[PDB]
Design a protein around this nucleic acid. Structure first.
Length: 86
DNA sequence: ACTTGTTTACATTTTG
DNA sequence: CAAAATGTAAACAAGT
């Protein structure tokens, strides 16, 4: 098991991201590629990821431009919590 | 059928 | 000795 908190994995997925933002499935793919450990039991840890993403205010939800209206929004970091490293 | 998102509830962990 | 951070499970609502 990798030694990172779920909040750290989301943060790390968003920073390595191009646009410094990520859809949900972007976070998932980053975590699943980077660590094959999270290839097993996706349902449980992806619930923990949604729980952390919703509950932690350091993460901010960014919709599409104007009316993009896609399946989810993007996710980004807060310009105050990004000082905290992983 | 599912994905996404919010929230509650409870268990575990980690140091003043 | 709670407390705060964190993990896990789960019920539930809104959405081409």
């Amino acid at each position: 098991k990798p030694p990172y908190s779920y909040v750290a994995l989301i943060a790390m997925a968003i920073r390595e991201s191009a646009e410094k933002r990520l859809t949900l499935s972007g976070i998932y793919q980053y975590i699943i590629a980077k660590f094959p450990f999270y290839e097993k039991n996706k349902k449980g840890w992806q619930n923990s990821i949604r729980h952390n993403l919703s509950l932690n205010e350091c993460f901010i939800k960014v919709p599409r431009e104007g009316g993009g209206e896609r399946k989810g929004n993007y996710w980004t970091l807060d310009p105050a919590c990004e000082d905290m490293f992983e």
